[PDB]
Design a protein around this ligand. Structure first.
Ligand SMILES: Cc1c(NCc2ccccc2N2CCN(C)CC2)cnn(C)c1=O
Length: 101
């Protein structure tokens, strides 16, 4: 594990603690979210982020932050502001960026 892998594994653990239900743990499917893949061009989830760390696909903290923001932005695009997914996406986006300083 490279230094960047160890730091991103730390950040991901801290970010997932903010999603105790694991709403963001796995990819959203069109089966449970009608039209999701037609509205969201670039899906992201914490599970895919873990796999990218393990594969050493993140070469900067900026790239990891961009995937976290994408995951949150996707939830705030597909879902209405009154929904659990939208409200948690917004909360963890701000708290996560603050946490990662
Ligand atoms: C983050 C998110 C979701 N996260 C949860 C989620 C993600 C992937 C697969 C299933 C689930 N749901 C878990 C809770 N169940 C009540 C429904 C199925 C689901 N739908 N949408 C549209 C989202 O944006």
């Amino acid at each position: 594990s490279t230094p960047i892998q160890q730091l991103l594994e730390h950040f991901l653990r801290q970010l997932q603690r903010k999603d105790p239900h694991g709403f963001f743990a796995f990819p959203v499917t069109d089966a449970i979210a009608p039209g999701y893949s037609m509205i969201i061009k670039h899906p992201m989830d914490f599970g895919t982020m873990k796999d990218k760390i393990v594969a050493n696909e993140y070469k900067s903290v900026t790239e990891f932050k961009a995937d976290f923001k994408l995951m949150c932005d996707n939830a705030m695009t597909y879902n209405r502001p009154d929904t659990v997914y939208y409200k948690l996406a917004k909360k963890i986006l701000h708290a996560g960026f603050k946490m990662m300083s």
